Amino acid sequence: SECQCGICMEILVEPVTLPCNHTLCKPCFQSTVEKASLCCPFCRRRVSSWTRYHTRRNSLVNVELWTIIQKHYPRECKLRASGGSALKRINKELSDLARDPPAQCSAGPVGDDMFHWQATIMGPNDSPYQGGVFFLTIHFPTDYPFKPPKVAFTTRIYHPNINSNGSIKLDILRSQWSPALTISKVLLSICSLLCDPNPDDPLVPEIARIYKTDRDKYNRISREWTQKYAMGSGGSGGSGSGSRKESYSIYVYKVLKQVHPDTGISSKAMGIMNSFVNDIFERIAGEASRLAHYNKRSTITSREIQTAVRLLLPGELAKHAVSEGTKAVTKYTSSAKAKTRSSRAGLQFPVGRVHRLLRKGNYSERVGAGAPVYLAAVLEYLTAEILELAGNAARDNKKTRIIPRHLQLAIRNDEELNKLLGRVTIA
Ligand SMILES: [Cl-]
Ligand SMILES: [Cl-]
Ligand SMILES: [Cl-]
Ligand SMILES: [Cl-]
Ligand code: NA
Ligand code: NA
Ligand code: NA
Ligand SMILES: [Zn+2]
Ligand SMILES: [Zn+2]
């Protein structure tokens, strides 16, 4: 409807309508226009005199609108009873896109990094890119939405307005950016650009010439490139790791039985164990993603997992973790394909599930089979290390059940574990 706020992405409250006839809620207007700019954030129209004119008379609010909004949509305004900033905006855009994604597109954060997203675009049916799946990277600036996102292809594509760096010449990405635009709108505009290039303002002149001279040749090469570079990679869909809190209680219990078979673990302690596992998962995979992008690799393999482990884990933990991961990958590759993936690897932690979580987190275009095996073995090893020391702490205190205090002692009393996990809250 026409009653949404384009800056904060909400129903308008105390709306202020500028002479350019852009409107924004009084909170946003005060934050952006009154405090500093004295210009419309959408079109940059100067409103210096107009604001002072009305501010000294308490006549900023569009009373007719405001008064109309409250009577005609009181239920919607019940939300307005409830009523960083860039982070809030990004999160709202994700919520909206997660519900109904743009046609032919999906996008979501990379791991827990809200300012770095992955996007995928299916080649429009209209276009010669049909059948291909095109990956993109999205970086939001700190002052989003008042500055555009950086959007570039990571999949090679033949197009007059997209070059070998993946850069996209498209006006709304730069000169025509406005905080009224969303990532959903951007991806749709990119889809239209694939269907209808702009050869008159090209990024790659040679391709634009062919598009204007020999369209047949343009279409043939576009299909050839689609087949060569945009096939066999559909992505994980969705919109990132989501808000679900993953549990590994099943596997923590199994490991505890192996390490301390006469020792139990409380429900609160299990919650903390899940926090440890999830935190280590995110840090290792986030670093492996960094390495894949940095080296322009479409697939995360056990190579990036190992290098991530060597950088992030301290001393002996890193060496033992690397040994465990290497041995798991070796056992996995020389095993019978009939058994379960975890069984092939000699692991308790679920290899298939870790593989899915590595794909769901948008860390890379593809994930090789060795990666989840290596990571699952590292998570299992660290879990066993923690449980061994926490059970020792329990036994030191003449207890038979691990509670959060015993987890805090295990971490604090081991120099390397405190380095790795000391920043995770227990309390
Ligand atoms: Cl994959
Ligand atoms: Cl691999
Ligand atoms: Cl105790
Ligand atoms: Cl006793
Ligand atoms: Na309108
Ligand atoms: Na609002
Ligand atoms: Na995804
Ligand atoms: Zn607002
Ligand atoms: Zn304006």
According to DSSP, the β-strands at 264-265 and 299-300 are unpaired
Based on the fold, state whether residues 360 and 416 are members of the same structural domain: yes
Query: Given 83, 106, 126, which residue is the final one in a domain?
Result: 83
Q: Is the dihedral of CA 184, 188, 194, 198 positive or negative?
A: negative
For residues 85 and 114, the answer to whether their CB atoms sit within 8 Å is no
Based on the fold, state whether residues 202 and 220 are members of the same structural domain: yes
Residue 382 lies in a domain: yes
For residues 7 and 18, the answer to whether their CB atoms sit within 8 Å is no
Question: Measured in angstroms, how far is the CA atom of residue 35 from the centroid of ligand 6?
Answer: 18
Which of 189, 84, 192, 194 minimizes the C-alpha distance to 129?
Answer: 194
Query: Given 196, 229, 262, which residue is the final one in a domain?
Result: 229
Token duo for residue 255? 């490991």
Residue 359 lies in a domain: yes
CATH of the domain at 158: 3.10.110.10
Based on the fold, state whether residues 21 and 166 are members of the same structural domain: no
Question: Measured in angstroms, how far is the CA atom of residue 406 from the centroid of ligand 4?
Answer: 18
Based on the fold, state whether residues 294 and 353 are members of the same structural domain: yes
Residue 272 lies in a domain: yes
Question: Measured in angstroms, how far is the CA atom of residue 53 from the centroid of ligand 9?
Answer: 17
CA distance 405 to 388: 14
CATH of the domain at 17: 3.30.40.10
Q: Which residue has the tokens 């380095």?
A: 419
Based on the fold, state whether residues 266 and 217 are members of the same structural domain: no
CA distance 422 to 408: 9
For residues 243 and 369, the answer to whether their CB atoms sit within 8 Å is no
Residue 239 lies in a domain: no
Backbone angles phi, psi at 39, to 5 degrees: -140, 150
User: Identity (one letter) of the amino acid at 248?
Assistant: Y
Residues 6+ away with beta carbon under 8 Å from 317: 382, 385, 416, 417, 420
CA distance 385 to 382: 5
Question: Measured in angstroms, how far is the CA atom of residue 388 from the centroid of ligand 4?
Answer: 20
Residue 236 lies in a domain: no
Question: Measured in angstroms, how far is the CA atom of residue 266 from the centroid of ligand 3?
Answer: 12
Ligand nearest to the CA of 397: 3
Based on the fold, state whether residues 354 and 223 are members of the same structural domain: no
Domain count of the chain?
3
Distances (CA, A) of 74 to 11, 71, 205: 11, 6, 55
For residues 9 and 79, the answer to whether their CB atoms sit within 8 Å is no
Residue 195 lies in a domain: yes
Residue 104 lies in a domain: yes
CA distance 324 to 301: 16
Token duo for residue 34? 């009154």
CB crowding 410-423: b at 16 or more within 10 Å, else e: bbeebebbeebbee
CA distance 272 to 237: 30
For residues 191 and 122, the answer to whether their CB atoms sit within 8 Å is no
Q: How many CB atoms lie within 10 A of CB 118?
A: 26
CB crowding 191-224: b at 16 or more within 10 Å, else e: bebbeebbbeebbbeebbebbeeeeeebeebbbe
Based on the fold, state whether residues 79 and 34 are members of the same structural domain: yes
CATH of the domain at 390: 1.10.20.10
How many residues are given for the chain?
A: 427
Torsion from C-alpha of 254, 256, 258, 263, nearest 10 degrees:
-130
Would you call 186 helix, strand, or coil by DSSP? Answer: helix
Based on the fold, state whether residues 367 and 321 are members of the same structural domain: yes
For residues 245 and 194, the answer to whether their CB atoms sit within 8 Å is no
According to DSSP, the β-strands at 366-367 and 299-300 are parallel
- The experimental technique used to determine this model is X-ray
Work out the angle between the directed axes of helices 315-333 and 370-396 (0-180°, nearest 10): 130
Based on the fold, state whether residues 20 and 161 are members of the same structural domain: no
Work out the angle between the directed axes of helices 215-229 and 205-213 (0-180°, nearest 10): 130
CA distance 128 to 160: 13
Token duo for residue 156? 């090679």
Based on the fold, state whether residues 259 and 311 are members of the same structural domain: yes
Based on the fold, state whether residues 279 and 326 are members of the same structural domain: yes
Token duo for residue 198? 């702009």
Would you call 119 helix, strand, or coil by DSSP? Answer: strand
Token duo for residue 236? 């994980």
- Indicate the burial class of 275 (C-beta count within 10 angstroms; 0-12, 13-18, 19 or more): middle
Question: Measured in angstroms, how far is the CA atom of residue 117 from the centroid of ligand 7?
Answer: 9
Preceding peptide of 372 cis, ω within 30° = no
Based on the fold, state whether residues 79 and 98 are members of the same structural domain: no
End-to-end CA distance of the chain: 46
Would you call 245 helix, strand, or coil by DSSP? Answer: coil
What is the extent of the structural domain holding 274?
A: 249-421
For residues 109 and 240, the answer to whether their CB atoms sit within 8 Å is yes
Residue 427 lies in a domain: no
User: Identity (one letter) of the amino acid at 155?
Assistant: T
Resolution (A): 2.0
Question: Measured in angstroms, how far is the CA atom of residue 29 from the centroid of ligand 8?
Answer: 7
Query: Given 229, 264, 297, which residue is the final one in a domain?
Result: 229
For residues 127 and 142, the answer to whether their CB atoms sit within 8 Å is no
Work out the angle between the directed axes of helices 249-259 and 267-294 (0-180°, nearest 10): 110
According to DSSP, the β-strands at 401-402 and 23-25 are unpaired
How many Cα atoms are found within 13 Å in the side-chain-facing hemisphere of 281?
A: 31
Question: Measured in angstroms, how far is the CA atom of residue 9 from the centroid of ligand 6?
Answer: 7
> What is the Cα Rg of the chain in Å?
27
Question: Which DSSP state fits 241?
Answer: S
Angle at 333 between CA 329 and CA 336, to 5 degrees: 130
How many Cα atoms are found within 13 Å in the side-chain-facing hemisphere of 371?
A: 26
